[PDB]
């Protein structure tokens, strides 16, 4: 959900 796995 965060960092390299953030989605915008």
């Amino acid at each position: 959900a965060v960092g390299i796995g953030a989605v915008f």
Partner: antibody
Amino acid sequence: EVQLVESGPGVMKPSETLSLICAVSGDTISSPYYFWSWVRQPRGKGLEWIGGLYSNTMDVYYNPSLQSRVTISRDTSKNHFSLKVTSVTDTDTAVYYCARERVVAHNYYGLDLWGQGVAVTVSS
Amino acid sequence: DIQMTQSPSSLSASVGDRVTITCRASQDIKNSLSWYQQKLGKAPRRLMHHSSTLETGVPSRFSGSGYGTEFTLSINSLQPEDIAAYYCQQYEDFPLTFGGGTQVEIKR
């Protein structure tokens, strides 16, 4: 060649302010959908994430174990990503790395990069 | 505050053997897990993200598995170039946190 290169004096007396710069060359610091991190490693021990930011927003995120002492920032005119640590002590001695990693869901073909690390000694 | 508990702290196996490192998270992290390799004196280099998706250039003898709270990295045919520290990292929540690390030795 896209590369991260770190600079900054690494030898500190106790209670000085550590100041490190991470310069990207071959790319722009503003290139979107990268997650930039500062990470540190004491000799013989594991890795600790200090904090970081996404290149497409202006927030920066901090580890709570260090947030009272560190400022992480970014200067797009000089392509610099920066770490400042106030009141360093015995415990801050470590190799400090920056990293630029793709935000995978919006950037599958950008390049994951690391600095060479800077060795920080806090000593009298 | 999500703890990553990595085991074992060190492991020793002959060239060609099959080794596993495990990593358990203090709370559900779905498949938001990366594994990194660090050779002595060098920066870490990521072997995989999303629990099991290898990065480019990473030999296919490395593989990962797991979803939820327990995760495994496997090395199918341990090679001498594999002498390194290995770290898991979760990225389900800030702050990012790493496993304590595993040192890999070749048994000769």
